[PDB]
Short mmCIF file of C-alpha atoms and ligand atoms in Angstrom, two decimals:
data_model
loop_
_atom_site.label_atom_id
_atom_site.label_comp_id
_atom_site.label_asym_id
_atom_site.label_seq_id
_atom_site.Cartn_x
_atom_site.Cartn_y
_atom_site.Cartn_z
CA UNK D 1 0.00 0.00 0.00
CA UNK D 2 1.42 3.41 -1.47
CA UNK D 3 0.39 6.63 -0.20
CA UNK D 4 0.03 10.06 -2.62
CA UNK D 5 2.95 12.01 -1.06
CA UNK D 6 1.47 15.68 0.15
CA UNK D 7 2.72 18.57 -2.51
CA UNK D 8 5.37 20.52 -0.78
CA UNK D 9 3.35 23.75 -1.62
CA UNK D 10 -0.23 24.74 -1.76
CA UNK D 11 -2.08 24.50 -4.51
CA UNK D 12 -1.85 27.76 -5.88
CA UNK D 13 1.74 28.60 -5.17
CA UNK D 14 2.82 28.10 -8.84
CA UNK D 15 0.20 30.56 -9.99
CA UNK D 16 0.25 31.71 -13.11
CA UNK D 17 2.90 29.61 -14.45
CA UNK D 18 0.88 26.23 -13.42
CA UNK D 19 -2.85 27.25 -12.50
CA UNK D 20 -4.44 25.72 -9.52
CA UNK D 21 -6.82 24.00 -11.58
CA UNK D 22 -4.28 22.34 -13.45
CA UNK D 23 -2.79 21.06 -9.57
CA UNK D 24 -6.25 20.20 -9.20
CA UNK D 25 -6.29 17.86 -11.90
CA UNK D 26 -2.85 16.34 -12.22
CA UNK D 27 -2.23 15.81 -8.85
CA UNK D 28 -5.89 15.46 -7.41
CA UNK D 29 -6.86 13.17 -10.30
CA UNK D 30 -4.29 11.97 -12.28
CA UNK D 31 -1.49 11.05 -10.02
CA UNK D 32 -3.92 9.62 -7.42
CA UNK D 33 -5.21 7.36 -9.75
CA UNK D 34 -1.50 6.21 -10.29
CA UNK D 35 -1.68 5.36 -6.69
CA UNK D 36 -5.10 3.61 -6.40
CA UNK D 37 -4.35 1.77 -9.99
CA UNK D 38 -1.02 0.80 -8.47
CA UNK D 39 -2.21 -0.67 -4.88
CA UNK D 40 -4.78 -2.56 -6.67
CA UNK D 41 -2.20 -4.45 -8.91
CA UNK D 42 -0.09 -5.17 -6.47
CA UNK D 43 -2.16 -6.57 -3.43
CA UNK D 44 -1.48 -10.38 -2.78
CA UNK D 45 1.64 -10.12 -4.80
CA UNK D 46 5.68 -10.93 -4.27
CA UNK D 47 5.26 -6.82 -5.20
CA UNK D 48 3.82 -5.76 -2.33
CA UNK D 49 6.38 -4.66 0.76
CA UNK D 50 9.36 -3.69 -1.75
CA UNK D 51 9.70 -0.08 -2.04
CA UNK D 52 8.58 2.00 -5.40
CA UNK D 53 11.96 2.10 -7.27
CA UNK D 54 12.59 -1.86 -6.94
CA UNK D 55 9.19 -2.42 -8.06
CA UNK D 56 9.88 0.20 -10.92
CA UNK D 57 13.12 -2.00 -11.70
CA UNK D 58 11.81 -5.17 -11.68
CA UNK D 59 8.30 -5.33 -13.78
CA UNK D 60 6.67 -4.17 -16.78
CA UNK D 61 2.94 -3.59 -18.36
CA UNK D 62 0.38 -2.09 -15.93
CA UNK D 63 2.22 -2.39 -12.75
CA UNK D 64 5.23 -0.99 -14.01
CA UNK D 65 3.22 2.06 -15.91
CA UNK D 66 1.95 2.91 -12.87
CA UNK D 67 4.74 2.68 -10.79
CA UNK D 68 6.68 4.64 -12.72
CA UNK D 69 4.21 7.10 -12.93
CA UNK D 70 3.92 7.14 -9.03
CA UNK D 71 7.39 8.20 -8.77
CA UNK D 72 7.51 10.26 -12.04
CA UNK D 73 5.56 12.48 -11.03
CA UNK D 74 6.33 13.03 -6.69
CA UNK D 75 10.30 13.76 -8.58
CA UNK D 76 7.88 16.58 -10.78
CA UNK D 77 5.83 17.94 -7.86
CA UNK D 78 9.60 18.18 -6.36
CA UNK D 79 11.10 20.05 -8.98
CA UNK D 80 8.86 23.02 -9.26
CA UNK D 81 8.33 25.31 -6.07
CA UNK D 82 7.36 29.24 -5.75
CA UNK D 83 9.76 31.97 -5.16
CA UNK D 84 12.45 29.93 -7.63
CA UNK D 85 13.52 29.26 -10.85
CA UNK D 86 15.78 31.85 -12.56
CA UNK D 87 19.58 30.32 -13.11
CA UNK D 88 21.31 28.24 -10.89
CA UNK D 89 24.48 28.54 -8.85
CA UNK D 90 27.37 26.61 -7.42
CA UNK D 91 27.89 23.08 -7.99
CA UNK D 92 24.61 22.50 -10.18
CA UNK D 93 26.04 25.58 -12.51
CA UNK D 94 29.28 24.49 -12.71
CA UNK D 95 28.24 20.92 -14.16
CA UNK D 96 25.46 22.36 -16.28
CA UNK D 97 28.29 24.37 -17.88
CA UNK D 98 31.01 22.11 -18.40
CA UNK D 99 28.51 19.43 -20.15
CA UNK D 100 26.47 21.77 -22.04
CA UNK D 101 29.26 24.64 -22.89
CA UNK D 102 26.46 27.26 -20.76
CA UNK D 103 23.08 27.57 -18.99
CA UNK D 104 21.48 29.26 -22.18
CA UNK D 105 22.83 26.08 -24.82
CA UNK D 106 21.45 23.91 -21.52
CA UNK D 107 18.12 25.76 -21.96
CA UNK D 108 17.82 25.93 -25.53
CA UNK D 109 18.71 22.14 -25.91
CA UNK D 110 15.99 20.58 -22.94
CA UNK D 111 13.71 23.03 -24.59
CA UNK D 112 14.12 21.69 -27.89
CA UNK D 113 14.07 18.07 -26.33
CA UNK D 114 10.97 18.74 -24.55
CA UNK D 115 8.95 20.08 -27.73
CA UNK D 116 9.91 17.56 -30.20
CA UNK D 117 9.04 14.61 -27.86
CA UNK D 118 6.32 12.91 -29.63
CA UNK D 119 3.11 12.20 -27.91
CA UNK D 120 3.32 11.60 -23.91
CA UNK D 121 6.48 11.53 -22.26
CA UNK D 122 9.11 12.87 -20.20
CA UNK D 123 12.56 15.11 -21.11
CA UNK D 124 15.09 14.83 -18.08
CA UNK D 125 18.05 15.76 -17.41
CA UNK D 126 20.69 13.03 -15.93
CA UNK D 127 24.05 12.56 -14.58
CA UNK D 128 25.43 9.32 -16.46
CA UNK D 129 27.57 6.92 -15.02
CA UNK D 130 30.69 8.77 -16.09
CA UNK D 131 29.90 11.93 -14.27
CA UNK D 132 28.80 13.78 -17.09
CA UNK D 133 25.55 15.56 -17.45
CA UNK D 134 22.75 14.67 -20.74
CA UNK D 135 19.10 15.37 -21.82
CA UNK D 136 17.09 12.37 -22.17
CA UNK D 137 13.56 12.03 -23.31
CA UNK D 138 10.92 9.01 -22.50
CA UNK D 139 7.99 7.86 -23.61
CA UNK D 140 4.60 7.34 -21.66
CA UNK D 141 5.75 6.04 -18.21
CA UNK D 142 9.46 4.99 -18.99
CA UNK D 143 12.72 6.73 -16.42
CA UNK D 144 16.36 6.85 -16.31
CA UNK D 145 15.28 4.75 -13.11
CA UNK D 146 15.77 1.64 -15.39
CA UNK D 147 18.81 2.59 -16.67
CA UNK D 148 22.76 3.61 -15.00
CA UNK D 149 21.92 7.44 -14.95
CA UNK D 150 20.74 9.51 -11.99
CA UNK D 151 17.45 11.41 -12.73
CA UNK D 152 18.12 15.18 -11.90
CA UNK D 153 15.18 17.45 -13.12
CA UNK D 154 12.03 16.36 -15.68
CA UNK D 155 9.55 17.90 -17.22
CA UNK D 156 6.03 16.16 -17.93
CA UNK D 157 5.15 16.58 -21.48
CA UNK D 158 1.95 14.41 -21.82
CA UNK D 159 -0.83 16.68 -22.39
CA UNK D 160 -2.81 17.28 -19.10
CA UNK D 161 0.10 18.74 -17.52
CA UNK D 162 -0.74 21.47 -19.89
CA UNK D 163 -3.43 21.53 -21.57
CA UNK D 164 -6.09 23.40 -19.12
CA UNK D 165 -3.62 26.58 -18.71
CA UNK D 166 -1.37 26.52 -22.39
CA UNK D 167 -4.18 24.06 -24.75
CA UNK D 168 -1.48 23.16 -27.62
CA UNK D 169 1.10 25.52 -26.79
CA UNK D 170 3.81 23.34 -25.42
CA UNK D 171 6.04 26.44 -25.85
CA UNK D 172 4.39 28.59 -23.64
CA UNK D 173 4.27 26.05 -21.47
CA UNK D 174 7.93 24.85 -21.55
CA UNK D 175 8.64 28.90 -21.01
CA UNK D 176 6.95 28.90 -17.95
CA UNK D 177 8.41 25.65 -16.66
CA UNK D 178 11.72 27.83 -16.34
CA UNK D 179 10.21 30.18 -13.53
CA UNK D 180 9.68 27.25 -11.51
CA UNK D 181 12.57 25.17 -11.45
CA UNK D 182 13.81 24.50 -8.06
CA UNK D 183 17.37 24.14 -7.96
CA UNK D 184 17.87 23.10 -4.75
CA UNK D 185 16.13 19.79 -5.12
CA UNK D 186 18.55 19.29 -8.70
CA UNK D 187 21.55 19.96 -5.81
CA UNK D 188 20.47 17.27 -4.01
CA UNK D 189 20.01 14.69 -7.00
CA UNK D 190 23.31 15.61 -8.24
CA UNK D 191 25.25 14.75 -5.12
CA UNK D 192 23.34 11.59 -4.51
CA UNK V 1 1.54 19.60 -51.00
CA UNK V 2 -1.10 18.36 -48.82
CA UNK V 3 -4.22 19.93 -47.72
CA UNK V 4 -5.96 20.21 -44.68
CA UNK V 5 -9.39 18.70 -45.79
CA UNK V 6 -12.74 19.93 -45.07
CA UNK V 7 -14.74 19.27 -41.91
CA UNK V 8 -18.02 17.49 -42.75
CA UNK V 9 -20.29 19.80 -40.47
CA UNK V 10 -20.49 23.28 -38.71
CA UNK V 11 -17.84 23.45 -35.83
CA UNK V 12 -21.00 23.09 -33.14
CA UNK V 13 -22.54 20.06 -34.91
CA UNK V 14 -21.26 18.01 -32.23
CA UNK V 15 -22.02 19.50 -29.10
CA UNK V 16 -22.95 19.08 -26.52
CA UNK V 17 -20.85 15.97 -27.39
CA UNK V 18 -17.71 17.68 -28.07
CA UNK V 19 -17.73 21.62 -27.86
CA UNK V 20 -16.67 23.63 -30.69
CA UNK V 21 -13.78 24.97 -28.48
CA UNK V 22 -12.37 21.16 -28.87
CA UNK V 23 -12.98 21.26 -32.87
CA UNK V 24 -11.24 24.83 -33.26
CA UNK V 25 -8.21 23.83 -31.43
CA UNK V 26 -8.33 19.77 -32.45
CA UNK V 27 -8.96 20.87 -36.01
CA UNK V 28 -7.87 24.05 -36.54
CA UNK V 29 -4.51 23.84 -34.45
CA UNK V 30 -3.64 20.09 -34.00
CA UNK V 31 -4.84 18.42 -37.45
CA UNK V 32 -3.39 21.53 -39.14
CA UNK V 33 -0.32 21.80 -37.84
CA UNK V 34 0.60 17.55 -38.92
CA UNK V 35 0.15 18.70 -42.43
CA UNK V 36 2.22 21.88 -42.02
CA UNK V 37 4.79 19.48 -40.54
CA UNK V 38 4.56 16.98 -42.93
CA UNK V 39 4.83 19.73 -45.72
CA UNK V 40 8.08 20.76 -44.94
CA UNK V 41 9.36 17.53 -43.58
CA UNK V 42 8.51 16.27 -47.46
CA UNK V 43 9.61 19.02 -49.52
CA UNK V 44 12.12 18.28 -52.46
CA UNK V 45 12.23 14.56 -51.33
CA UNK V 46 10.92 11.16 -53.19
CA UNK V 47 8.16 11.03 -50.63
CA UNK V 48 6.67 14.48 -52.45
CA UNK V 49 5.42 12.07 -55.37
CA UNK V 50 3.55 9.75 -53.59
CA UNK V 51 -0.20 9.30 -52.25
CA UNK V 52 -0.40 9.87 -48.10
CA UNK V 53 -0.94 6.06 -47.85
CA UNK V 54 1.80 5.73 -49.60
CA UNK V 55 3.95 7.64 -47.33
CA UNK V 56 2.19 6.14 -44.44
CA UNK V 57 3.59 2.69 -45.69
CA UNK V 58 7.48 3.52 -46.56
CA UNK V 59 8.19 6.16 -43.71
CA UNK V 60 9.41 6.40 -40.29
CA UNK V 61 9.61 8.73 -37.67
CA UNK V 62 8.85 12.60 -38.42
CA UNK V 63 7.92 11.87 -41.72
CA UNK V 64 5.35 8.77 -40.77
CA UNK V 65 4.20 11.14 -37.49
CA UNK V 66 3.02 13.39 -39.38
CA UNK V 67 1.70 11.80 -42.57
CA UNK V 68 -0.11 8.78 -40.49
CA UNK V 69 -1.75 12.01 -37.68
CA UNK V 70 -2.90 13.74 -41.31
CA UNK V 71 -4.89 10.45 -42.19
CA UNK V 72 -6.13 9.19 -38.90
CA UNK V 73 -7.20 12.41 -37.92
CA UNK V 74 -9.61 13.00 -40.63
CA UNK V 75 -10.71 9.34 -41.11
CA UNK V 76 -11.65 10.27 -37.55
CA UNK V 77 -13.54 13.77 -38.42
CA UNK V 78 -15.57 11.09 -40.75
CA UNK V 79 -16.47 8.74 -38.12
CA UNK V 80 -18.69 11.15 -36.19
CA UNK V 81 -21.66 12.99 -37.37
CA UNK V 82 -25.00 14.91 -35.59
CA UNK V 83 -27.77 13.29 -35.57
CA UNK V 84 -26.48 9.37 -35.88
CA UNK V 85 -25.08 7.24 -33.14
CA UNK V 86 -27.52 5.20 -31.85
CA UNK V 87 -27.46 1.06 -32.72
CA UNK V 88 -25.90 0.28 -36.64
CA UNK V 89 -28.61 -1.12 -39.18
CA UNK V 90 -27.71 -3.41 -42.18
CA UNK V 91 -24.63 -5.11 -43.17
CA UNK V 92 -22.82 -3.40 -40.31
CA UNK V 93 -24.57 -4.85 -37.29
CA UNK V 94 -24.60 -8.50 -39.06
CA UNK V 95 -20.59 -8.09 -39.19
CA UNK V 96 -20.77 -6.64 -35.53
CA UNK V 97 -23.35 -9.83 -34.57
CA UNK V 98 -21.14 -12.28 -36.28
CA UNK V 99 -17.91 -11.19 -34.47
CA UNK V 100 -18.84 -10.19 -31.62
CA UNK V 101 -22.30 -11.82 -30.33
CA UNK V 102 -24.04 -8.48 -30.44
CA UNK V 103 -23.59 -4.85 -30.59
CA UNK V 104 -24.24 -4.19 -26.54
CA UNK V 105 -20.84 -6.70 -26.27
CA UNK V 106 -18.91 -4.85 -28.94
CA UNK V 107 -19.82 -1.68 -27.65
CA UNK V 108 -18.34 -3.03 -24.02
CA UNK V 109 -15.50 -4.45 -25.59
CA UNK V 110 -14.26 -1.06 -27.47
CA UNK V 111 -15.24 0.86 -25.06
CA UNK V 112 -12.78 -1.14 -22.41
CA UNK V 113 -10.27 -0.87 -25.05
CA UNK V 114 -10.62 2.50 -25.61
CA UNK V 115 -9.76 3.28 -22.09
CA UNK V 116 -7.13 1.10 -21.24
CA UNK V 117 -5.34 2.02 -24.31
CA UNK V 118 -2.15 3.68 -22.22
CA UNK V 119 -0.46 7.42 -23.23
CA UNK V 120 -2.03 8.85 -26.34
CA UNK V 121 -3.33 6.61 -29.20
CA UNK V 122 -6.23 5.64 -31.10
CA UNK V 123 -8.30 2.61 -31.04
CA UNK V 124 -9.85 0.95 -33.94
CA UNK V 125 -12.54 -1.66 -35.59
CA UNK V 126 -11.07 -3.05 -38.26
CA UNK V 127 -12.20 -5.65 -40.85
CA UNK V 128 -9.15 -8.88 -40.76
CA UNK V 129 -8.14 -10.28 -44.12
CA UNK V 130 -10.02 -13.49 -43.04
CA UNK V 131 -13.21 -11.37 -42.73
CA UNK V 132 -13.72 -11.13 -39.56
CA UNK V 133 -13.72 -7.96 -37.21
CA UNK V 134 -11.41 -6.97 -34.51
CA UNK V 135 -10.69 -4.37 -32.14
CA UNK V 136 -7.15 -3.28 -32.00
CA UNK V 137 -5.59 -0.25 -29.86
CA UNK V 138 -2.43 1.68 -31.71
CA UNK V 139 0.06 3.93 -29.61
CA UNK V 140 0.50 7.65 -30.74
CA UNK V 141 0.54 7.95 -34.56
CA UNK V 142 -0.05 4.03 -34.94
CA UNK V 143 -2.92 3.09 -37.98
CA UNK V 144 -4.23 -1.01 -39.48
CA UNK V 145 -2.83 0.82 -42.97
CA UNK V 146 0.61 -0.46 -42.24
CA UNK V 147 -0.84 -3.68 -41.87
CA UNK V 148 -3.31 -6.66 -43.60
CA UNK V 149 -6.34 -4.77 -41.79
CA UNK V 150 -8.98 -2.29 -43.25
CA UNK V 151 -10.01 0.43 -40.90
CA UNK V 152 -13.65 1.13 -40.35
CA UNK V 153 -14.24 3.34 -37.14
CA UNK V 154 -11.54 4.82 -34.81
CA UNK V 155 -11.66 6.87 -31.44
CA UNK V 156 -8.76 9.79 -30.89
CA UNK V 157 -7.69 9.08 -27.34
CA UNK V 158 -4.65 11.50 -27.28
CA UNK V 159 -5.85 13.75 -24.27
CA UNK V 160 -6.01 16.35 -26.62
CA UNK V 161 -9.26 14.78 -27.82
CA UNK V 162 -11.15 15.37 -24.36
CA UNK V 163 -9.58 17.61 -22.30
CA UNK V 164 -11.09 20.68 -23.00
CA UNK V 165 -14.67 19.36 -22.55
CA UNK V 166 -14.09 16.40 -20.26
CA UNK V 167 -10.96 17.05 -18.37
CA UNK V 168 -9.37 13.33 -16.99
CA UNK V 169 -12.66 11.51 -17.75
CA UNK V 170 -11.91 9.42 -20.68
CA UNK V 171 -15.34 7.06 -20.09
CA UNK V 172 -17.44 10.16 -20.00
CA UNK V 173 -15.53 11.14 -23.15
CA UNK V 174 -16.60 7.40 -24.64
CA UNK V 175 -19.74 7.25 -23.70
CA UNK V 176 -20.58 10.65 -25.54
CA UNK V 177 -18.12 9.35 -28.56
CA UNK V 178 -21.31 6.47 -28.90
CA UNK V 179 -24.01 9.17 -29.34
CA UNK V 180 -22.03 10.80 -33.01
CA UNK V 181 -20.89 7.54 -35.00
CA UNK V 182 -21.44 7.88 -38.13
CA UNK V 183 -22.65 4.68 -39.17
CA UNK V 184 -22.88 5.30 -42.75
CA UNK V 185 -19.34 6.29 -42.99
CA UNK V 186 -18.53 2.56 -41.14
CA UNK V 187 -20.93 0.80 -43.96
CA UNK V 188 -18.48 2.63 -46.57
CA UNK V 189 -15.36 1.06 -45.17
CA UNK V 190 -17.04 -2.31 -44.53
CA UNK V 191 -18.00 -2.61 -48.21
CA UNK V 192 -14.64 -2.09 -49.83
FE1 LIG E 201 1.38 13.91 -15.59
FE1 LIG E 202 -6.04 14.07 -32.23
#
């Protein structure tokens, strides 16, 4: 038995980049249905009593969709906060840089990533196993998580996370995105 | 050069069903910008002098995105109508008896389909080489033309499709997809 994690802001505290309607929705709706869909599945299986990540490891189909999707998006809901975004300092700017030449090519590339990811997904960005820093995108529920690299900031593209506040514009929405980033939870993932 | 085609009715033939805010924004921003895409992703190549089907069957990636959303999106236009839905008549609901054991048991079985079909996608009836009919679910710009099968009805279940007028609830989105098939469209593509 999973539990939806509480958002570590109120509902309208990324107002007007991300409405409270759209919090409403994605995390009222969607990603509790993650959770219910997910505790159903698993109930009377070798599944239930490991923890999220080793269940995201080990399966596939439905109880690895929503799995994934559990964590996918409690790492999102920890990646945006009020009173942030803007660029980033110290260590988190320092390895931004010397993978992606600066913060603006850094930008300008997850941007690009995130927009040209066809139909629902994810763009992240991870540390890989040899220290350096890359943009990856994924499709539907898939993370680094089954892979060597350590997630450090993602972006839902599928369309409700949206769609209410931006309808088609994914730009406007990826633009917005920016004023929210919350750099102090990408300093933790980076030194973990 | 491709055009977008014509819709088949006024932009508020559908409603209460689905709005005219989702057809100017489906429609008029969605299925128009896969044929902008597909226009320049084409120009001054071989696949400039060949049918869409055509492209749909030697293409991959960008190229097949696009030319496969052009065609499924306004196969899909054709599927719906105002003042149809209701229970088929003639040929079609002896194929849908014959496959299925009747048309409330079809209607269950596309229905479940329909919603379980995972991240955005389309799901289809489609008439098997044997003769036979079969419901089969396709992920993002997936279509039967790259296979043996002949389409005959299809439901959009990107989110795009609903959001606007139904938010998260894909059933209540089905349910009011029953009350607009265009049954005459389906006897068409059963008879060829
Ligand atoms: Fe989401
Ligand atoms: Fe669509």
């Amino acid at each position: 038995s999973f539990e939806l994690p509480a958002l570590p802001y109120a509902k309208d505290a990324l107002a007007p980049h991300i409405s409270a309607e759209t919090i409403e929705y994605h995390y009222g709706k969607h990603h509790q249905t993650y959770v219910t869909n997910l505790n159903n599945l698993i109930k009377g299986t070798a599944f239930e009593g490991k923890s999220l990540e080793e269940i995201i490891r080990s399966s596939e189909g439905g109880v690895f969709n929503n799995a994934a999707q559990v964590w996918n998006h409690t790492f999102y809901w920890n990646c945006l906060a009020p009173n942030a975004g803007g660029e980033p300092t110290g260590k988190v700017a320092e390895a931004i840089a010397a993978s992606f030449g600066s913060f603006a090519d850094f930008k300008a590339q997850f941007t690009d990533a995130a927009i040209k990811n066809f139909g629902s997904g994810w763009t992240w960005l991870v540390k890989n196993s040899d220290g350096k820093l890359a943009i990856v995108s994924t499709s539907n529920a898939g993370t680094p998580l089954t892979t060597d690299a350590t997630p450090l900031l993602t972006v839902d593209v599928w369309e409700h996370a949206y769609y209410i506040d931006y309808r088609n514009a994914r730009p406007g929405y990826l633009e917005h995105f920016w004023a929210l980033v919350n750099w102090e939870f990408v300093a933790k993932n980076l030194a973990a």
